[PDB]
Amino acid sequence: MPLVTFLPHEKFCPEGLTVEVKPGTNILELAHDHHIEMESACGGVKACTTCHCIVRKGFDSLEEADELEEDMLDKAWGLEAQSRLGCQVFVADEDLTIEIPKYSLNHAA
Amino acid sequence: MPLVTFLPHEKFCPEGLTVEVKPGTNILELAHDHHIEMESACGGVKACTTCHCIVRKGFDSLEEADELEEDMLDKAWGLEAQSRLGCQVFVADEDLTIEIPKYSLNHAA
Ligand code: FES
Ligand code: FES
Ligand SMILES: [Cl-]
Ligand SMILES: [Cl-]
Ligand code: NA
Ligand code: NA
């Protein structure tokens, strides 16, 4: 059973979180299940950047981002080679380590 | 009568805004009066960074930031010499030009 690790984040998960999950688990859904309140402005349909995360371990196990996701990621703060939209990340067969970025696009409540 | 200029921002004010205002006008209040929906998470009491702005013209006309404001600004994305918390900016006797930052601390809705 793959482990997902959320790295510590001052706002969303100060102590971090490590959890065993089934293959096919959605990262955004998992975060919300554990009250890691990652924003999901567009409702998880690859139309914002608020669920931006960086998959620092296990990125290469994941299904490749589609064009819609890649186009949104081009707009994100702090884009990296392992950036993903959290709403589109589904755990496969390997452990993942997820960093939630410190910064994001400034937007209205 | 001083002019306040908000520089164009993709999310908050795509075309920018220039308005004549009375001395003593609060920048956050003014922005909201013109549906420039700058976030004000703490309710305008110098306890967050969501109203962060950069006063690119007229900064030196303003009352100096107090210690509470300076301590919050130390936490803001993209801190500059002319950074202020918008909720604490009151127009004095000179025109102001205000830039709303592109990025901010990533936080929950
Ligand atoms: S919640 Fe908008 S792209 Fe993920
Ligand atoms: S609204 Fe929180 S410091 Fe200005
Ligand atoms: Cl972003
Ligand atoms: Cl900020
Ligand atoms: Na904001
Ligand atoms: Na956010």
Automatic annotation (TrEMBL), chains A, B:
Protein name as annotated: 2Fe-2S ferredoxin
Give the UniProt family note: Belongs to the adrenodoxin/putidaredoxin family.
Which cofactors are required for activity?
[2Fe-2S] cluster
| CC terms in the record's Gene Ontology section | cytosol
Q: Where is the 2Fe-2S ferredoxin-type domain?
A: 2-104
Q: Which residues bind [2Fe-2S] cluster?
A: 42, 44, 46-48, 51, 87
- Please name the GO terms that the record assigns under molecular function: 2 iron, 2 sulfur cluster binding; electron transfer activity; metal ion binding
Source species of the chain: Pseudomonas putida
- Metal-binding as a keyword of this entry, yes or no, is yes
Q: Which UniProt keywords apply?
A: 2Fe-2S, Iron, Iron-sulfur, Metal-binding
Looking up InterPro entries in the UniProt record yields: 2Fe-2S_ferredoxin-like_sf, 2Fe-2S_ferredoxin-type, Adrenodoxin-like, Beta-grasp_dom_sf, Fdx_isc
Pfam families reported in the protein's UniProt record: Fer2
Q: Which GO terms describe its biological process?
A: P450-containing electron transport chain
